[PDB]
Amino acid sequence: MKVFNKLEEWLGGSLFIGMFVILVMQIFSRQIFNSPLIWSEELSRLIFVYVGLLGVSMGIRSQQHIMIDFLYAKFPKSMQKIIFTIIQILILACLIFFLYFGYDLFIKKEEIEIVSLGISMKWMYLALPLITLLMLVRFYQAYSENYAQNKVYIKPIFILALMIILVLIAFIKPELFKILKLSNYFDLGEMTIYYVLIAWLVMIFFGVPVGWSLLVACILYFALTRWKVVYFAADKLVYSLDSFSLLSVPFFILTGILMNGAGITERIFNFAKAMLGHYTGGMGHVNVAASLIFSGMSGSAIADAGGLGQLEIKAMRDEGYDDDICGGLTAASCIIGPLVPPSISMIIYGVIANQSIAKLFLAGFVPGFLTTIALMIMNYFVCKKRGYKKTAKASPKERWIAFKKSFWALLTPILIIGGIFSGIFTPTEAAVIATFYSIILGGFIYKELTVKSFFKHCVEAVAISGVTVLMIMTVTFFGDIIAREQVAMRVAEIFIKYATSPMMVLVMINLLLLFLGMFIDALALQFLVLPMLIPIAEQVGIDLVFFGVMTTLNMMIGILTPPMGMALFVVAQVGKMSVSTVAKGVLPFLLPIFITLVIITIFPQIILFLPN
Amino acid sequence: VQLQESGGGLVQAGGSLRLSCTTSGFNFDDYAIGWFRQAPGKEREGVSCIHCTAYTPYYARSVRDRFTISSDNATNTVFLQMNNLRPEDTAVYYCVADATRYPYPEFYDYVGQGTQVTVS
Numbered sequence A: 001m002k003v004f005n006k007l008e009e010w011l012g013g014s015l016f017i018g019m020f021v022i023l024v025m026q027i028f029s030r031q032i033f034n035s036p037l038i039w040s041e042e043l044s045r046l047i048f049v050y051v052g053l054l055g056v057s058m059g060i061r062s063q064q065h066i067m068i069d070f071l072y073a074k075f076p077k078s079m080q081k082i083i084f085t086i087i088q089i090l091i092l093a094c095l096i097f098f099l100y101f102g103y104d105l106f107i108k109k110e111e112i113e114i115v116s117l118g119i120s121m122k123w124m125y126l127a128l129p130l131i132t133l134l135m136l137v138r139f140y141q142a143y144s145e146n147y148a149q150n151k152v153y154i155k156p157i158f159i160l161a162l163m164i165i166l167v168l169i170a171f172i173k174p175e176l177f178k179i180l181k182l183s184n185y186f187d188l189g190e191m192t193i194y195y196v197l198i199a200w201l202v203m204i205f206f207g208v209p210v211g212w213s214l215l216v217a218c219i220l221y222f223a224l225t226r227w228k229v230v231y232f233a234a235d236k237l238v239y240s241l242d243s244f245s246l247l248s249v250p251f252f253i254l255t256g257i258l259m260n261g262a263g264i265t266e267r268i269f270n271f272a273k274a275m276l277g278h279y280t281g282g283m284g285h286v287n288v289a290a291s292l293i294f295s296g297m298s299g300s301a302i303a304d305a306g307g308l309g310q311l312e313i314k315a316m317r318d319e320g321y322d323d324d325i326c327g328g329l330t331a332a333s334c335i336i337g338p339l340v341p342p343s344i345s346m347i348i349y350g351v352i353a354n355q356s357i358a359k360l361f362l363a364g365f366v367p368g369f370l371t372t373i374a375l376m377i378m379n380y381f382v383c384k385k386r387g388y389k390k391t392a393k394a395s396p397k398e399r400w401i402a403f404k405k406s407f408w409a410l411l412t413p414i415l416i417i418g419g420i421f422s423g424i425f426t427p428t429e430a431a432v433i434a435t436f437y438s439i440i441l442g443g444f445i446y447k448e449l450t451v452k453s454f455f456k457h458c459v460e461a462v463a464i465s466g467v468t469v470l471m472i473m474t475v476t477f478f479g480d481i482i483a484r485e486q487v488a489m490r491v492a493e494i495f496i497k498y499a500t501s502p503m504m505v506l507v508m509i510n511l512l513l514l515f516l517g518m519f520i521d522a523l524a525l526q527f528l529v530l531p532m533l534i535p536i537a538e539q540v541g542i543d544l545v546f547f548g549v550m551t552t553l554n555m556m557i558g559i560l561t562p563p564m565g566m567a568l569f570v571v572a573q574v575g576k577m578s579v580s581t582v583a584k585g586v587l588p589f590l591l592p593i594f595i596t597l598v599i600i601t602i603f604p605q606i607i608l609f610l611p612n
Numbered sequence B: 001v002q003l004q005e006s007g008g009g010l011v012q013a014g015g016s017l018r019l020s021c022t023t024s025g026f027n028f029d030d031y032a033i034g035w036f037r038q039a040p041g042k043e044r045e046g047v048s049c050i051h052c053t054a055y056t057p058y059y060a061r062s063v064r065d066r067f068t069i070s071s072d073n074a075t076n077t078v079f080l081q082m083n084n085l086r087p088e089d090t091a092v093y094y095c096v097a098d099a100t101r102y103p104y105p106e107f108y109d110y111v112g113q114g115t116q117v118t119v120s
């Protein structure tokens, strides 16, 4: 049917709205009255397991799961089909692993009961195989698409036959899989983890998606040593989604779209353009101030660029600014987004490093202001050197009219930051209250949010969060494998051998991240290196909240470095200018960002001020 | 493959308990040896192992820096020295050995009788 082919859409939007309503009820019944609910958090997490798995299925269907294609795109067309076919078969093996070890978990945890809800725990684990069948469906459709464009080599009826054969073997006679058990053939000794790792790297550099590459690495490690433990480790594929700190990942995404599709960012930009803009290089100040105010609502740099680039570039080019400075400033001011709270990079770090998220937000607040001031200063110097003209001051009536019109938008960060700093709201409760306030703003104070559009925004929020959920739940699986073998301790010994002072360790880490971010996207890098880099930072005595802020700011530079910069591509698309022009125009503005990075590296007491 | 344990009992905080495990019936060097913990009613948790990890002994997160695992190939013995015993470590410690050198002491093939640790 035509409604089955869009099933995760209406099954994830509805569950998302249900979770949103449940959390809203919890927040109101805990604050307005002194009578909190006890079944709210656990039920919301139970719903989020299904929502995240539906997002993963959408990612499988759309082939939007993050990969590293620096070397993959350089192969010839003839030699690329073979690699892509092998990648598809690897994804199929991952999906069958998911199905088998989700069904086993469902049939093993039928006795443990959730205390608050009263239902058995299986109703959570049932999400893993039940959606996985759906995934397989999507996979096949995806492969058929990949075969209609001659992107593979195997006819997609052999893939269907292989899929049903493997499922029948897995649920009829699993013994036939013992042929594939590699521990019957190889005896690598205690250093198997140093083989699978390089195997992982090969898979990473041939274009395998990060989540599937990590899952295949775990499968290889457990097949090479002892398979009997993968029946117990696979639980980490589901226990990593039953997290209350992870529910804030979609909501902070959702409130980053309801603040653009409601026509709110236009009002904020108009207010900034009224207050500033009559200064020297005033339009640059308007750009940076608009990005600073909008960073208190959204938690992504790409959302900031997409939502404000057209407005800011148009306003700057109305005043006779050159294209290079327009593109450079509107691309460099994006990074203020994932620094001022809320941010999604810090939530991912707090999940990976098991750090507090409120402390991460409060710590990262100050570097955002340092970057804002530095960018304003650099823009002022650039415009005063070029000698750009000065716009007339806004009339005292307009400077008040614009503020009154865009007055309810400005209160969003005070709900969020003031809700987190004051301790009234946890980051997830802050996310839900921000979502509710954004709905009230767009639908009832500005009258620009319908119900169909709100549902579409919920669906795309789920779709966006799925590609992070997959990587989260496979990184949690691979982290224990890589941390029981003490690989990070060996790498830390090597670093201490090469770096004398802890400052030398910080410089080496920063150079490594700056070099990697040139070719590797920030989202992929944050799961590629951070699991194997946080333990080194812990061992050499580095504080992990400061390390998280520093790595976030270091990878946010990586979206401006022009071998591979996402912000450069986004700004080039929204500004109708070549990526070369944007890349050249951001070169002067990397100096203030580097200065901020250096002065937070050598003065960590700046960052660790608000949390303490 | 006989793994006979000794040591344990009841102590206060910081009592610094010490446990020993004598192994017989195999090569003390080939087989990965170790200890795991099990609370009175909760799931078993790995504590430590030698010969499992390539370079340094494996320690669990909740027992890192305050548990030390030592080897004596002369008498084929494994020692566990505890430091700063919190009252949450009142459990049973089992000595295990396995023919595969991988760091999972809770799923090792062989296992000894087990010794009780009580912390007040």
Ligand SMILES: CCCCCCCCCCCCCCCCCCCC(=O)O[C@H](COC(=O)CCCCCCCCCCCCCC)COP(=O)(O)OCCN
Pocket (backbone or CB within 6 Å): A089, A093, A096, A097, A100, A158, A162, A170, A174, A175, A176, A177, A178, A179, A180, A181, A182, A219, A220, A223, A227
């Ligand atoms: C036209 C198509 C051409 C290409 C064909 C591709 C065919 C290969 C596809 C790969 C399939 C991988 C599936 C991975 C998940 C397995 C699901 C669970 C398997 C399972 O339980 O097996 C146990 C042992 O199997 C095991 O030990 C299995 C471990 C497998 C690990 C991965 C193997 C390494 C890769 C080898 C690739 C070889 C390719 C050449 C054909 C059985 O035992 P039990 O305890 O469950 O007992 C049962 C009593 N209930």
Ligand code: NA
Pocket (backbone or CB within 6 Å): A294, A295, A296, A297, A298, A299, A300, A336, A337, A338, A339, A340, A341, A342, A343
């Ligand atoms: Na932000």
Ligand code: NA
Pocket (backbone or CB within 6 Å): A291, A304, A305, A308, A309, A312, A329, A330, A331, A333, A334
């Ligand atoms: Na911008």
